Every structure is written in C-alpha cells, then in structure tokens.
Design a binder for this molecule. Structure first.
Ligand SMILES: Nc1ncnc2c1ncn2[C@@H]1O[C@H](COP(=O)(O)OP(=O)(O)NP(=O)(O)O)[C@@H](O)[C@H]1O
Ligand SMILES: Nc1ncnc2c1ncn2[C@@H]1O[C@H](COP(=O)(O)OP(=O)(O)NP(=O)(O)O)[C@@H](O)[C@H]1O
Ligand SMILES: [Mg+2]
Ligand SMILES: [Mg+2]
Lengths: 309, 309
C-alpha cells in the first residue's frame, strides 16, 4: 500500500508520501467544503461527495463553507471529505491507502500531558466513514495511525539534544498558536500550550478589510517588495498590514512569557515566517540553537514522514 | 459563609451573590494582569499580588498583560489572581467564602459529552493556591463547586420544556463562540460545540484598527446613534465596524448550520446583542421560543445563582 502522511489542519491539508521509485512528494489542498453539491452547467469541474447521506462539494469561494475552526472538526464528517479530496487531487493513483494523521496537541494529550486514548481512537474511527464521489472512484483508507502535532516536526532536532535540554516548538497556524516544550531525545514533555484566538488569519483578515483570499495572501508574502504591491493593486493596505503584523508579534511574544527553561527554539507552521524575527530577538536564543526551515507549512508532515515511513 | 457564583471568563470575571438581607448583587472585573508588581509613586492605587512566589498586578493598559485566551488559563495561577481581585473589588467584606465557578463546555465535558472528572478536580484544586496582597488581606476560598458554562443560563427555560424539545444555547463571548443543544428538563445534552476563533473581540479589534479599548467599546454599544459617534470622535470607523459586524454575523450563521432538530433558541454572553437579529431571522424560530435578556453578559452567572444558591 501507499503510506500517506497527513497534516489535516483547519486551513490546509498537507500531504507527504514516497513514490514507488523512492521519490518524496508533498501536496496541499484547501479545506473549504459546502454541505451541498456544486452545480456545473458545463464550465467548472466539480467534486461532489456523499458522506453519511449528506452532500458535500469542494468550494473555495462560497461564504457558506462548513466551519473548520471548532474543536470537534478533527472528528467531523467534513474532515473525512477534506482528506479524501486531498488524496484525490494529489496525483496519487486512486487505491487503498494506509495513512498517518495528526491531532492538535491539546486533543492528542489531556491536561496532564498524557495521551488522550479516547480522542486518538475517535480520530482513527472517523476515517471508517464511507464516502462516494460523483464520476470517479474514491481512495480506500485502510490502516490509520495518529501522531500529535508539533512533536514530529521537532523530532529530528530532538534526537541531537541532551536529555536535559528542551526544545521550544512554536507553531503559528492559520487559526491557532500551539506550543510544546519537549525534553531532549523526546524523553518527555514539560509543557503543552494551545491558543485558538491567534493565527495568520488575523493578518489575512486585516489586509482583506483594508481592501480574493489570494490578493491578501499575495500582498502578505510580497510585503518586502514595494513594486509588487503598487503593481498588484491601485499605502493604506500597507499600514494596515504592518499594524496587524505588529499586533501579531506582540501577542506571540506575550505568549512566550508563559515558558522558561528552554535551551532550543524552533518555529513551524505557515505563520513561522511572520514571527521568526521577533521570536529570535525576544528569546535571545543563540543562533545555532534556533531552528526554522524555508518550507515551514510542511515541517510537521515531513517530520511525521521521517518517523513513520 | 457568603456563597459567590463566578463566571471566570477570558474577558471579564462576572460575580453574583446574595447579601445578608437577601439582596442580590452582581459585579464585573477585567482579567488583565501582568506578571509583575505595579509601581505607584503616589498617584495610582495598585493591587500587587503574590501567588506561587510570582508577582502579579492588576493592569488594564500595559500590552504585556498575561494571556487569558489559551485553554489552560482555566487552571492557571493568573486565573486565581483574577478571581481574588474580582472578590476584592466587589464590595464584599474580606472573608472566608465558598464559590461556584465554571468550566467552558469543552473542558467540563469530554468529546463523548460526559463530565470530565479530571478537569473538574483540577479546576477545584486551582483555588487552593495561596495568594497574598500588598497592603490588605485576601479572601479565603473554602468550598469550590464547578458547573459547566452555557447549561445554567438556559436552565430556567429548560425546566419548562418537554423532555423531547431541545434548547439551542448560543453563547458569543469575547474570544469564543460556544453552543450547546440540550434536551428539555435537562434530560440530556445532544450536542456540544466550541470555536475559539470568533468572539466580540473580532469587532473590537476591527474598530480599533480603523482608528482606549473603551473608545472602541463605546463606539460599538452606541453604533445606533449617529450624533454620539460624530461627537465621541473627529465615517471610516463606521464602515469598518459594519463590515466586522457583517463578517461576525456571517460566521455565526455558518456555525448554526452544524445544528438541527432544536425547537427553542437562546442567545447569551456579551456578544448576544450583536448577533441577536441575525440569529432570530436565520433560525426562523417562532418568537415565543426565542430567548434573550437585556443583561446577556450575566445570564450564565445568574443561572448558576438560581441553581446553586
Ligand atoms: N512563507 C509564508 N508566509 C506567509 N504566510 C504563509 C507562508 N507559508 C504558509 N502561509 C500561510 O499561513 C497559513 C497557515 O498555514 P498552516 O499552518 O499550514 O495552516 P493550518 O495548519 O491548516 N491551520 P491550524 O489548524 O490552525 O494549525 C496559510 O494560510 C498559509 O497559506
Ligand atoms: N450589550 C452589549 N453590546 C456589545 N458588547 C457587549 C455588550 N455586553 C457586553 N459586551 C462585551 O462583550 C464582550 C464579551 O463579554 P463576555 O461574554 O462576558 O466575555 P467572556 O465571558 O469573559 N469571554 P469568553 O471566555 O470567550 O467566554 C465584552 O468585551 C463585553 O464588554
Ligand atoms: Mg497546523
Ligand atoms: Mg463567557
């Protein structure tokens, strides 16, 4: 079977898997689905699913998309649809697959930092829900393993740490800021933290107000090039973005005040690039001990792959 | 002992209690504390606390206030400080008190909608942490009981419902939208929902951007009076607020699509007035079965009082 590692996040589903020839592929797919089939009169291609006697369709523009920011989204029908759609648009041949998926830190672990067995099993069972697609066959999910978010992204680093050092893993997602503090060699977890009131979406929504999702996203990724901005549009948007970024940074730095005793720091998630500078400065962590990739939104799923593949 | 009912929310702490003479009092106190004593050279009055060998002070203006939007805030040192400060500014005489406090729906209950016993006990034990105040004595918390959020606010109504009807309780807080669907006579809970990516703060922050916290709060509460706006300031702020409100409404209505089979609807929390209209319209719930007070931010703590007092 193909083995697919899946970071099913509330913004995008990230996939990683190894091809027959040993080539490693990554994939990303939005999770925007409405609880209704999409109608095409001939122009658009549509992905119309049925899950539990309910219609779903991929829809990246309707405002009536199903919410994905609630806690129980991890165990929802629409999550299952989102994962099947990701598989279906990945380029993998339709087939039986084993998967490894994630639960957010505060779902994977209980408030005593021990694995939450009931949540883990609920996550596995969710993918037994049966799905159909109009005008095509669907992947068949077989074995399901569950990992926590965060930890796998830091594991390659954790292997190099003294059992006594501890890595601070800072994950700024689209809708959440989650942080773990983990003992070297993954000998234990000293602290877990989850705050769903801040994510990249703060900045995206701010920019959007000053003014699709793409325009704002493009404006943000190209904030360092003045000609792109002037070109892409027709000074206000700019100030708004900088204030959003400023407020984002302020709150992230506030959050870090909840942690101490860490010797190493790593920043992951799609928002890593937006707070990287402010986090390095504030932590005063000597650079050899500060970790950030150039593909931050895939750090988790890559770490999962290196562990479980 | 005085018995104090406490809704310790991430924005404000709400208190309710009965006086010796049977008079019912309510109180509200912000939860903004920095992990450091506040310095007064003679002008300001300061509340400087020590919790676990750590300094805290009430601070409604410094940006470095301790975060209160993370999940574990319910079990934090700073929560304990916030509750003692609320008591201390309530007008109650300093003394030994029994209290009833709340856990959010998704902390009080596990993902199988059964009471989470470990979380409940962790909440009780939190108030055993010892606290001191500079230049004054602190209340002594004795017995602690814990109720869930939401349910108590709807209980007076639930008593009147057929065991077969079900009340949809919609709680828009400062940082969270939580919803329960409860069988009449509190015979059971059919569904629990928690989304921490939306709250009144969306609107408050939007207004603030268009431009203290008060100015934005005042602008919002008086959005229906054009002279107040013109007077309070020096058209932009207006459009921004209306777009924030519009987006708020859109997402709340999206959330309601996750629920069905309810015969009654109730809207509570500080944000109830901001979505009341859109919720009544969208639900198409006949008015005798739609419940909203004129003191929405105290609905929970009042319901707790009526139950436990
Ligand atoms: N280099 C970058 N600069 C700016 N934004 C980025 C960058 N890379 C990714 N993003 C965006 O950051 C957002 C968050 O990405 P991501 O962390 O993968 O979301 P998520 O995992 O699905 N959300 P969550 O459930 O809260 O953890 C997305 O909208 C990305 O497009
Ligand atoms: N009638 C009103 N109109 C507009 N805003 C209001 C009104 N009443 C209260 N608010 C505000 O709404 C916000 C949310 O209040 P509240 O629901 O009590 O917060 P909370 O319980 O502490 N937050 P949370 O932990 O997310 O549940 C506060 O900032 C209030 O000031
Ligand atoms: Mg993520
Ligand atoms: Mg509340």
């Amino acid at each position: 079977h193909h083995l697919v590692f899946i970071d099913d996040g509330s913004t995008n589903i990230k996939l990683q898997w190894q091809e027959s020839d040993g080539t490693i592929k990554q994939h990303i797919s939005p999770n925007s689905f409405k609880r209704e089939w999409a109608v095409s009169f001939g122009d658009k291609k549509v992905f119309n699913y049925t899950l539990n006697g309910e219609q779903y369709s991929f829809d990246p523009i309707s405002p009536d998309a199903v919410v994905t920011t609630n806690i129980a989204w991890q165990y929802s029908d629409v999550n299952v649809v989102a994962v099947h759609h990701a598989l279906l648009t990945s380029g993998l041949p339709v087939s039986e697959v084993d998967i490894v998926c994630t639960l957010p830190l505060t779902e994977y672990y209980d408030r005593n930092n021990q694995p939450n067995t009931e949540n883990i099993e609920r996550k596995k069972a969710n993918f037994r829900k049966k799905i159909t697609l109009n005008g095509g066959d669907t992947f068949t999910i077989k074995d399901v393993k569950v990992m926590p978010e965060s930890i796998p992204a830091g594991y390659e680093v954790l292997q190099e740490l003294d059992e006594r050092d501890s890595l601070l893993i800072i994950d700024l997602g689209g809708t959440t800021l989650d942080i773990s503090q983990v003992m070297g060699k993954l000998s234990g977890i000293s602290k877990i933290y989850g705050d769903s009131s801040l994510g990249v979406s703060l900045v995206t929504s701010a920019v959007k107000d000053a003014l699709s999702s793409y325009l704002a996203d493009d404006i943000i990724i190209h904030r360092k090039d003045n000609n792109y901005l002037k070109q892409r549009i027709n000074s206000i948007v700019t100030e708004a973005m900088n204030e959003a970024l400023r407020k984002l940074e302020q709150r992230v730095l506030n959050t870090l005040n909840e942690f101490s005793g860490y010797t190493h720091v790593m920043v992951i998630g799609g928002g890593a690039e937006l707070i990287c500078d402010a986090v390095k400065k504030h932590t005063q962590i000597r650079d050899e001990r500060f970790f950030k990739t150039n593909n931050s939104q895939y750090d988790l799923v890559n770490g999962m792959y290196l562990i479980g593949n």
